[PDB]
């Protein structure tokens, strides 16, 4: 019953003409609820979950103002970092930032995050205590010194431990119907004969939420990872997730193999067998 709020920002410079492409998205747990895309016509923060549409015009005005200001900061940063790294004005570069908070089952502050990347590599991040900085190279160190002088960490801390948690709690209440509902995976097994000697058993988990899940195989009650293939968890497109794990087995020995499913929506883990 623990939860998270996270915002993700990507800015990509367009050296030939104009301002960077800027995309911002907000999530509660695994549910996107807001977006901004600099390429879109509205130039507004837009809703992406029914429960945020409950918020009034003042909310949308404030979030639009803020997200536009965020876009300007990253635009400036793209130029600054180009300078720090002594790069030409010719190439496209990328900055990425993620920030937000985790709460426990009590819906009180557990952890905060504020991290930043340049061209896909760690640049600077707040440490877990939210009081000091991890800078990856001497360019990031220039930013660290600046942010230390300006007491940036203290301003960020206050949001992460306060405002972030307060609004997460509001969203969790307002979106109770979905955000506080767990969708247990719908499970089944399939079988395919590859040869006279070999068969594949595939254990499916569908339509689950949240995305976190564990799928494992056992042979005669012992963990089996050899001759298995596990795909990365993928979105169904309706807010839920999918995953499968497969095992290659001697034809005729299917009964030895059991699939094991762990998910927050299941009281006890599930055990499946080929019938």
């Amino acid at each position: 019953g623990s939860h998270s709020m996270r915002y993700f920002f990507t800015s990509v410079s367009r050296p030939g003409r104009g301002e960077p492409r800027f995309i911002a998205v907000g999530y509660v747990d695994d549910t996107q609820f807001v977006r901004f895309d600099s390429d879109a016509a509205s130039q507004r923060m837009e809703p992406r979950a029914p429960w945020i549409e409950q918020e009034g015009p003042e909310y949308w005005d404030g979030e639009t103002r803020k997200v536009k200001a965020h876009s300007q900061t990253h635009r400036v940063d793209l130029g600054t970092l180009r300078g720090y790294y002594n790069q030409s004005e010719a190439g496209s570069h990328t900055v990425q930032r993620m920030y937000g908070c985790d709460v426990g089952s009590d819906w009180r502050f557990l952890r905060g995050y504020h991290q930043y990347a340049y061209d896909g590599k760690d640049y600077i991040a707040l440490k877990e205590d939210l009081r000091s900085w991890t800078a990856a190279d001497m360019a990031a160190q220039t930013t660290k010194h600046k942010w230390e002088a300006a007491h940036v960490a203290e301003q960020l801390r206050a949001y992460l431990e306060g405002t972030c948690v307060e609004w997460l709690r509001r969203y969790l209440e307002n979106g109770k119907e979905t955000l506080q509902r767990t969708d247990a995976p719908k499970t089944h097994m399939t079988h395919h004969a590859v040869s006279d000697h070999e068969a594949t058993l595939r254990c499916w988990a569908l339509s689950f939420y949240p995305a976190e899940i564990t799928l494992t195989w056992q042979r005669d009650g012992e963990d089996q990872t050899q001759d298995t293939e596990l795909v990365e968890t993928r979105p169904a497109g309706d807010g839920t997730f999918q995953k499968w794990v497969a095992v290659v087995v001697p034809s005729g020995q299917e009964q030895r193999y059991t699939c094991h499913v762990q998910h927050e929506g299941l009281p006890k883990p599930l055990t499946l067998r080929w019938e």
């Binding site: 915002y7 907000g26 404030g62 979030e63 803020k66 997200v67 200001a69 965020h70 900061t73 400036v76 940063d77 600054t80 970092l81 920030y99 930043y116 600077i124 930013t143 600046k146 942010w147 300006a150 940036v152 301003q155 960020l156 949001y159 405002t163 972030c164 609004w167």
Partner: peptide, 9 residues
Amino acid sequence: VLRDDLLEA
């Protein structure tokens, strides 16, 4: 809700 402000790097 987003942060009120972000300082430049």
